Design a protein around this nucleic acid. Sequence first.
RNA 1: UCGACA
DNA 2: ATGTCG
Length: 133
Amino acid sequence: EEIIWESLSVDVGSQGNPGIVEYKGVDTKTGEVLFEREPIPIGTNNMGEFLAIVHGLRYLKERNSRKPIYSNSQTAIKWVKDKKAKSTLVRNEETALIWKLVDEAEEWLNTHTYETPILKWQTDKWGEIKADY
RNA sequence: UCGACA
DNA sequence: ATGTCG
Ligand SMILES: [Mg+2]
Ligand SMILES: [Mg+2]
Ligand SMILES: [Mg+2]
Ligand SMILES: [Mg+2]
């Protein structure tokens, strides 16, 4: 129905897909950028979306914040729930970095608890997510 | 054979 | 185009 303004919004930007991937997290209310990841040379959109949610979980947990996280990504939301990023991206020397990060994000999920609700941003009703590039 | 989310 | 799920 309506936007939970007291929340963190995450989004991915890329150049190519697969291509250069980055992400950021913003306060949904103020649009202030709370974190921004250095570009990863090769990755997929969905891997970037996954890393952005997991990074948001880590960021909120460290700050003892109970705010929900908004993502526009059906795929990444499911991967986080499963603790398993089911990417098709070839795992080789060029994709080594993104895959290491993905493996580490999954490992964090398997060693930590969180209560953060992970919520689907309703683009069709609300327009583009605020963490949008 | 599609329907969605990016 | 390409990455993904239902
Ligand atoms: Mg997105
Ligand atoms: Mg990262
Ligand atoms: Mg930590
Ligand atoms: Mg976007």
